[PDB]
C-alpha cells in the first residue's frame, strides 16, 4: 500500500506480468504492507530468458573496455544513491540504516567496481606442442545465467551474482527472494540507466518453488547462481543439473566454528564474538554460532560477552542510533523463537535474551532479543543446526585439539576463525579448519579480492575475487595444426 | 572363464566382497567369458570409503615432491607393462591391438605423467588489503572423490581421472563399467607397487544403478567424476547434488559437427572425415559424426571418404594388423544397427557399410561394418542423436555462415573441427563454434596440456592441462588481521 | 617565443630550476621558438627523488582500490583534454593533427585506463612446504624509478611508463627528450589535478648528457624505463647498472621485416607496407622498413605502393587534411637525407621521393618526402640501418625459408610481419621470426593488453600488458616457520 | 697435484684449450695443488658459442616432455653420485663433508627436478581483442645464455642457474670461479650422460677478467646470470649490458639483518642467530650477520651464544665430525682476519674467536675462529660491509620501530629475519623490512619453489620458483589479423 505495484523488469524496462497474481512484500518493522508485487509466470520465464538471449549478444560484441566503462558508470550511480537504496533496504529486510548504508550498497558496488577493472585482463593460454602444432585456450561467456537471491543481503547479491556475470559478457536474470524484492528492481533501472543493453539485466518476481524453478529447468539458461538455505540447495542444484546438466554456483548456510584460544584477549574475543553472531540481528551466513572458549577463560569470556550484549541498541531501523533490528519476517521469528525454546528444553544455559521484545510499539514489529547460551553441547539442537538469528552457543574444551575436530565435526563448512595472539596457533589451527572462510582475529570482512564459499554441503563454486570472474567463462580449447595430418586408414 | 575370478581392491590389496554377487566380462570378438567379476555391496562402499579417508590422510602428509616421485614410478611401470596392459584392453573391449598399445597405455600414462611434474606448482595467492591486514588462499585436496568410468577407454579414462585426483592429494575410489571392468584392477596394483599408500587408490566393481549410485550418495565423498552417456551423466550429476552437494565433473556425449569449407584439401578433410568416425569402430565420444561439406565439393568428397571406407581393415583385434574391430557388447552392436536401420528408413542415402558382419568368425563377435550415409537432413535421428557406433552422416550446405548455425544446433556441445586453408576462416568460424574441444585441419588429439571437456549438455568441468587440477582443490581464503578489530556493538 | 618559460614540475607545481641554464624547443614545421625550457641541475635531481621518496610513501599507502580511482580520474580529464593535448603534441613534434587527436593522447590514455583496473589484482603467491611451514611472496613497489622519454611519442611514451609504474605503488621521475619536453609536463599537471599525491610524478627537463644521466646514475633510484636509440640505451643501461645495480626497461630501435608471401593480397600489402613505413612520416620505431616481395610480385606491388604514396597528402601538419608532416628537427632531416643520399650511391633503384620538399612554406619546414628505394640488397647501408624516417627497402626473395632467414640476419628484433592467407604459413612464418612485436595481416596495433618489446638489441623488458604490471614490483618471498628449528651447532 | 689437469668441456665432451695457460687449484685444507685447469681463450669462447648454438637448436626441437624426461635422468644420476660429488666439492671449497653431502648436491639436484616437471606448464596468453582479431603470446627461449659461477656453493649454483635455463630450452655456458672450476665440469658429464645433447651445457674455466669478461660481452649470448660479489655483479652487469644488451640475472652480496624482538624464544634465536652465522663458515650470502637483541635480553643472549659457539666442531672437512671447515683460500682468510682486526680497532667487543687457528695441522690450513663481536655501532666496518666469513656483529636496541628502520639502513637488502611468537609483530615487521628473502622463525632454508634474490644493491631478478622459469624465456606477441586492414594513406 506504501507503493505502488511492483512489475517484472525485462529488456530495459517494465513489463506487466502474465500470472493475474500478486504477492505482498511486508516492513517486519511495523508489518505495513510496502507494495503489490507481480509473480511472473511460466510464459513471463520465457520472455526474459528470449530479451536475456538478445541482449547478451548486444554486450559480448563490446569490447572489453566498453563493458568495463558501462559497469564503472554503475558504480557512479549506485554511490551517489547509496542513501535511498539503503532506506528502502531498510524498509524490506527491517536491518537498521547505520547497516545498509555504511555496507550493504557499499560493498555490493566495490565487487561491481572491482569486476569492472577486471574486464580487460579476461585471458586464454597459449601451448605450443611442436614446430607444427600449437593450442590457444579462450574464455568464453557461458552466455544466459540465472541469479537466485536470499532475503538477508538482497541488493549485496544481487550485485556480487550480477557483476562477475556481466563483467565476464554474460546476461543474468535475476530472482530476488519473495520476502525482499524491492531493490533488485532499483538495481535494473541502474544499470539500463548506466548504458547496460537492454536484456542483459532481468528481474523476475515470484515464489522459488514457481518462477526459481522454472528458472533452474530452462534448457537456455546455462548457469545458476544460488544463495540459501542448504536443503533449498540441493533441490535447487539437482534440478538444475538433472533439466540441463548446468553449471551451478551454491551459497549456502553453515554452523561456523570460533575458536578463542587461551592466550586470546578476551576483550577483542568477545567484539569479535558479538560481531559474529549479533549483527544484522543475526541473519548472516558467515555467523560464528558456535563459540569454543578454554575452561580457563569461560566465566571471564561469558561476562565480556555479556557487558556488550547489554549495550546493544535494539530498536527503530530507521533511527540511525538502532544497531540491531528485528528479524526479516515474522514466521522467521517464530522459527527462530522455536530453536530457543528448544535450547532450554534442552538444559543449555541461557545467559541472556530468549524472548521476543513485545514492549510498545516492538510488539508491531519481529523483534528477537541478542541470545546466548553457554555450557552447550554438541548434540544440543542449536549447536548442530543452522538458526540464522540471533543466537550464540558458547562451547567448552580442554584441548586445542579437541576444539577443531569438534569445529570440524559437521557437514557445514561455510566459515571460521580463531582468536590468538600466536603465530603458531593461528595458522595451523586455520589450516586443519575445515571451511572456505577462514578468519584470524577478525570476523566478517569480506573484500572484494577474496573469493568467498563454503566447503561440503555449505557450497559449491565462490564469489569474490578472480577466481569467480573465471567461472563465468567456459574455456574453449582450439588445437591448430599446421603441418601434415595421419589417418590410419 | 579364461581368468581367475576378480576381487574388489581396496586398501592396497584384493578383498572379498559382501554381496554374494557376480557378473561376467565377455570377449565382444568371439563370445568368450573372460572373467567372473565380484559386485560390491552397499557395505563394500562403505569400507572403500573409510579405506581412503585413512590413505587420503597419509598421502596429503607426504611432501609434493614426494608425491611426485611416487606417481613418477608408477608412469615407469605403466610404460614397461605397457603391451599387457594393452592386450588385456583389448580383450575386454574389443579394440585393436594396434590401438590399445599405442594409444590407450600411452596417452594415459602421458597425463599421469604431466600431473606427476606438476604437484609442486600448486599455488594459493596472497592478496595485501592494508598495513594491517592481508589474504592468502590455500588449494587443500577435495579429500575422497569418486571416478565413474566408461566402456570405450577403461584404462585410459582411470588414468585421467585419478592422475589429477592423486596429483592434488586426492584418494578416489573408482568404479570402472559393468562392461570393461579388468585393466581398472591392475591400474590399482601398479599404484600400490609404485608407493601409492594403501586406500588412496580403491576400485570397486558391480553396475552404476546400484555402485555408482551407492558412490554419488555417500556423505563423505566431496566429488564425483562421471564419464559416459549424456542421460545417465543427468542422473549422477543430480543424485550427486541432492545427497551431499558434491562437486561434479561431467565427461558426456555429443554430435560433434566437422565442416569442411569449400577451399580444403579434400584428401586432408576426407582423412580426417574417416579418423573422425570409424577410429575405435566409431566409438570415441568427440566423434565428429556430422560432416558438413559444401554442394560444390560433395560428390568428390563422397568419393574420397569411400576410397578411404573400403580400405578399412576390419577383423580379429588381436592381429596386429586389425584397425576396425568389433563394438563393445552385442547390445550395443543391436543398438547402433538400430540406429543405421532409422537412417534407411528415413530416406538418407546409404553410401556404404549398413550391415552387420557375419562372414565366417565374424559372426561370432560383434561387427558392424564401417556405414556412412549422405543427403542427410537435420531432422533425421541418426543426425540428431548420438549413435557411438561407426555412423558418419554427410549433410550438405550452401553457407559457410549456415553451416555453423547449424553445427551449434544441438543440445550438445563436446567437440568441432574445420578444414580449411585459410587463416580467417579457420580462427572466425571456430571461435563462434560451441564446443569445448576445437580442431582445426586434424581431429582427435588430445595432449595432456589440452583441458578438454564439453559445452551445454555434453559436460561440466574439464580433463587434463592446468585447471584440471585446480579443480581437484579446494579454495580456502584466509584473512589475517594484524591491527585492531572495530565492534559496533 | 610562442609559450612563456617551463619550469621543472616538482611536488605537484612548477619550481625554479638551480642551474641558470636554459635550451629551446622549436616547432619542426616552420623553425619559430616554441618556449625556453630550464636545464635541471644536479641539486635540482636530488630535489625530485626527495619529492619522489615521499610520494610513494603517501601513494603506497593508500588501497589498491583508490589508487585506481584517481588514475581514473586522470583518464577522464585526459578524455576530456584530448584535442589540446594533441594540438600541442602536434607543435612540439610536427606529427599531424589528424594523428596528434585519434593515437596519441587516446593510446596513452587507453594504457593507463587499462593498468588503473589492474591495480587490485596484483598478487603474490602462497607455497605450503609442510605441515608447520609455507611460504607467501608479496609484490612490492621498487619505489622511486625514472622514465626517460623519445620524442617521436612524447606523450604517449610518458603515459605507458607512468601509467603501471604508478599503478604498481611507485612514484616515476619523468625526463621528457630535450626536443619535445611540452606535453610530458602537461601530464604532470594533470595527474595532481587528478589527485596523485605530490612527488609521485614528477618531471625534470634537460639533456640526456646531464640530467638522464644523473638519474641513471642516482643511488636512490630503483628502475629506469628508457625508449629510444639502440646506442644510447647501452649507454643508459650500462649507466643505471654500474652505478647501484637498477632494474631496466629498454625499448630500442629496429630494422623490421615484413614479408610479403606470394599468396598475399597485394592491395593489403601494399596499404601494409605503406602504413609500416610512412605513418608520422616514418617515425616509428615498430617500422617494417625492409619490405620482403617475391620475385613473381616485384612489378605489380611496386606499382600498387606508387599509387599510394602518390596520394599522401604531404602538408602542414595543423592543417587537418594533412596525413605526412616534415621530420622532428632539421638535424634528424639531415640525417634521413644522409641515409637516402647513400642508397643513391649504392645503387639502390629509387622508386620515389628521395629529396627534401622546399617549396614555398615547406622549406621553413624539416619536410622529406615519402622515399621508397627497391631492389635493394642485404649489404646496403639502408637496408642494414635504422633511418627512423619515410625510407621503405623493398627487396626481392625467391623462396620462404630465404626470405625468414634474412629477415632474421639483423642485431635488431622489435618487430615482424607476414602477409598471407594462408593458415599454416601464417603460423609456421611468424614462430620463426625473430621479434618480440609480431603482426600477421596487419601493422602497428598495439592494444594495451598486448606486452610489446624487442628481442636482441632493440630490447630489454616489455610495455603494456600484465606481465609489466607486474615488472614494477619486486618479489619478497617471506617463509613462515611454525614448528622447531634445528641447528647443526 | 692430486687430479689430471681438467680441461675445458665443449659440445659433450672434454676439448684442449687454445690458450697455452693454466692456473692451479688447491685444496684450503692443507694448501696442497688439486690440479691444473685450462685457461679458455677467446677462440675456445668462440667455439663454445658456435657449440651452443647448435646444441639449443636440437634440444629446442624436443617437445617438452622429452626434455623433462632427460633433466629427470640427470637428476637420477646427481642422487646417485651424490657423495661422491659431495667428496670433490669438499676438496675443492673446504667446506665439511657433513654439509657436502646432505645440502649441496640434494638441493642443486631438487631444483632441478622441480623444474623439470615444469617444462610442459609453460604458456602463452591469449587475449580477444574484437570478433576479427586476437593475441597469443608465445614463451620462446632466450637462445644462448651464460651462468658465471660463485665458490661458496659452486656446483649447487651451477645447478640452480642450469636447470631453470634448461628447462626454458636454452642452451648454457658456465664459467666456474676460478677458486673451484672442478664440480662444474663433472655436472656437465652428468647432463651428457644423461641425454642432453651436445653444446647444451658447456663449461669454460680461466679467470673472470678474461673468460668471464668475453661470456659478458659475446654478442651472440642472450642472458648473462651471475652470483657473487656487489662489485663484481656492477661490472658484469654494466659490460653484459652495454656490448649487446643482454638480460641479467644477479645474485650479490649482503649485510642481512636478524631482529630478535623481546618475544622470542632466545635458546631459538640462539640458535638461529649461530646458524646464520657459521654455517659453511660463514660462506653464506643470506646469512645475517647484523644480529638485533633488545637490551633487557643482551646479557642472556650472548650466553646463549656463547654455549652454542664453544660446542661447534672446527676440524679436517673430511672427518664427518667437523661442522665448521676452513675458508676457502688463504687470501680470503686475510681479508676475514682484517675485517675482525678492523672491529677491534674501531672498540666492539669480542665476545669469542677473533684468531686465526694455527694449532698443529690447522696451521696448513685457511681456519678462521667463530667470531662474535657485541656492543656494535651501526658506523662500525664491521657492520657496514660484507665481511663473507665467520663473523657475528650483535647490535643492541630499545624499541621495534628503531630496530627496523636500523635494520633498513644499508645499501644491501638480499634477506632479513625476525625472531617472535607475535603473529601481528611477526608479519608487520617482515613486510617492513626491505629484503627479497624473508624468514620468520627460522633462517636459511631455501626451497626449489621459493623465488630467491636481493634488493637493492643485493641482486637483480631471482632463483627458483615459477618466476624464474618465465624469466628463462622471452615474450613473442602475434596479433592475427582476421578482417580488413584500414590504411590512412
Ligand atoms: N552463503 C551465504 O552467505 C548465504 C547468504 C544468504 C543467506 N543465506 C541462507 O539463506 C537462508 C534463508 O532462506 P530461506 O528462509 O531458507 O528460504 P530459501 O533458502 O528457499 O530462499 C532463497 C531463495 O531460493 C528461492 N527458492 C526457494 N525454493 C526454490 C526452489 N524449489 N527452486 C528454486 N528456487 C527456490 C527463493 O525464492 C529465494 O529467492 C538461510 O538459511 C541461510 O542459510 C546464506
Ligand atoms: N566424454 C567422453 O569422452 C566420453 C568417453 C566415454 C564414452 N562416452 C559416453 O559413454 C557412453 C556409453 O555408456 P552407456 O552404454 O550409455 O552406459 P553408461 O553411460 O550408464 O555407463 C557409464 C558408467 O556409469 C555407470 N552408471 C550407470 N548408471 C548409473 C547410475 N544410475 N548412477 C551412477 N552410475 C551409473 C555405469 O556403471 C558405467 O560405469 C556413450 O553414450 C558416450 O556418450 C563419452
Ligand atoms: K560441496
Ligand atoms: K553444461
Ligand atoms: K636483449
Ligand atoms: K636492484
Redesign the interface.
Given at each position: 500500500a506504501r507503493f505502488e505495484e511492483q512489475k517484472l523488469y525485462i529488456g530495459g524496462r517494465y513489463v506487466e506480468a502474465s500470472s493475474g497474481a500478486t504477492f505482498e512484500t511486508i516492513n517486519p518493522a511495523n508489518g505495513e504492507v510496502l507494495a503489490k508485487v507481480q509473480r511472473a509466470s511460466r510464459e513471463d520465464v520465457e520472455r526474459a530468458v528470449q530479451s536475456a538471449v538478445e541482449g547478451q549478444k548486444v554486450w559480448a560484441?563490446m569490447?572489453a573496455?566498453q563493458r568495463?566503462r558501462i559497469l564503472?558508470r554503475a558504480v557512479d550511480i549506485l554511490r551517489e544513491r547509496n542513501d535511498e537504496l539503503a532506506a528502502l533496504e531498510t524498509l524490506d529486510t527491517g536491518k537498521p540504516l547505520?547497516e545498509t548504508r555504511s555496507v550493504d550498497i557499499v560493498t555490493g558496488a566495490?565487487v561491481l567496481?572491482?569486476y569492472?577493472?577486471?574486464?580487460?585482463?579476461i585471458?586464454?593460454?597459449?601451448?605450443?606442442?611442436?614446430?607444427?602444432?600449437?593450442?590457444?585456450?579462450?574464455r568464453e561467456p557461458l552466455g544466459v545465467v540465472a541469479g537466485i537471491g536470499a532475503w538477508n543481503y538482497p541488493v549485496q547479491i544481487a550485485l556480487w551474482k550480477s557483476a562477475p556475470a556481466l563483467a565476464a559478457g554474460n546476461a543474468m536474470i535475476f530472482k530476488p527472494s519473495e520476502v525482499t524484492p524491492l531493490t533488485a528492481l532499483k538495481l535494473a533501472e541502474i544499470y539500463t540507466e548506466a548504458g547496460v543493453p537492454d536484456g542483459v539485466f532481468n528481474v523476475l518476481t515470484g515464489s522459488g518453488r514457481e518462477v526459481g524453478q522454472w528458472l533452474t529447468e530452462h534448457?537456455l539458461i546455462?548457469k545458476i547462481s544460488f544463495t540459501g538455505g542448504?536443503s533449498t540447495?540441493?533441490?535447487v542444484?539437482?534440478?538444475?543439473?538433472?533439466?540441463?546438466?548446468k553449471?551451478?554456483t551454491?551459497e549456502?548456510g553453515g554452523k561456523s566454528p570460533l575458536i578463542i584460544f587461551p592466550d586470546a584477549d578476551l576483550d577483542?574475543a568477545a567484539?569479535?564474538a558479538?560481531?559474529a553472531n549479533?549483527?544484522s540481528s543475526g541473519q548472516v551466513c558467515t555467523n560464528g554460532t558456535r563459540v569454543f572458549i578454554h575452561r580457563s577463560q569461560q566465566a571471564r569470556f561469558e561476562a565480556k560477552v555479556l557487558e556488550?550484549?547489554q549495550?546493544?541498541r535494539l530498536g527503530d531501523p530507521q533511527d540511525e542510533n538502532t544497531?540491531?533490528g528485528p528479524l526479516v519476517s515474522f514466521p522467521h521469528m517464530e522459527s527462530v523463537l522455536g530453536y530457543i525454546e528448544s535450547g532450554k528444553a534442552q538444559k543449555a544455559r541461557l545467559l541472556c535474551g530468549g524472548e521476543r521484545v513485545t514492549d510498545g510499539a516492538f510488539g508491531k514489529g519481529a523483534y528477537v532479543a541478542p541470545t546466548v547460551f553457554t555450557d552447550c553441547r554438541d548434540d544440543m539442537t542449536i549447536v548442530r543446526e543452522e538458526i540464522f538469528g540471533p543466537v550464540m552457543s558458547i562451547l567448552v574444551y580442554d584441548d586445542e585439539d579437541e576444539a577443531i575436530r569438534r569445529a570440524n565435526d559437521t557437514?557445514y563448512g561455510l566459515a571460521a576463525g580463531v582468536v590468538?595472539?600466536?603465530?603458531?596457533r593461528?595458522?595451523?589451527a586455520?589450516?586443519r579448519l575445515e571451511?572456505?572462510?577462514?578468519?584470524?582475529?577478525?570476523?566478517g570482512?569480506s573484500?572484494?579480492?577474496?573469493?568467498?564459499?563454503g566447503?561440503?554441503?555449505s557450497?559449491?563454486g565462490?564469489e569474490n575475487?578472480?577466481?569467480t570472474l573465471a567461472h563465468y567463462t567456459?574455456?574453449?580449447?582450439?588445437?591448430?595444426?599446421?603441418?601434415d595430418?595421419?589417418?590410419?586408414?
Open positions: 560484441a569490447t573496455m568495463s564503472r547505520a566495490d567496481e572491482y569492472a577493472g577486471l574486464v580487460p585482463a585471458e586464454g593460454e597459449q601451448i605450443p606442442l611442436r614446430e607444427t602444432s600449437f593450442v590457444y585456450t579462450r534448457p546455462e542448504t540447495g540441493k533441490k542444484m539437482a534440478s538444475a543439473s538433472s533439466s540441463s546438466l553449471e551451478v551454491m549456502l577483542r567484539d569479535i558479538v560481531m549479533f549483527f556488550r550484549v549495550r546493544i544497531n540491531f557437514e590468538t595472539q600466536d603465530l603458531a593461528a595458522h595451523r586455520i589450516h571451511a572456505g572462510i577462514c578468519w584470524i582475529n577478525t570476523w570482512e573484500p572484494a579480492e577474496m573469493p568467498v564459499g566447503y561440503k554441503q557450497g559449491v565462490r575475487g578472480l577466481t567456459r574455456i574453449k580449447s582450439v588445437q591448430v595444426e599446421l603441418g595430418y595421419a589417418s590410419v586408414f
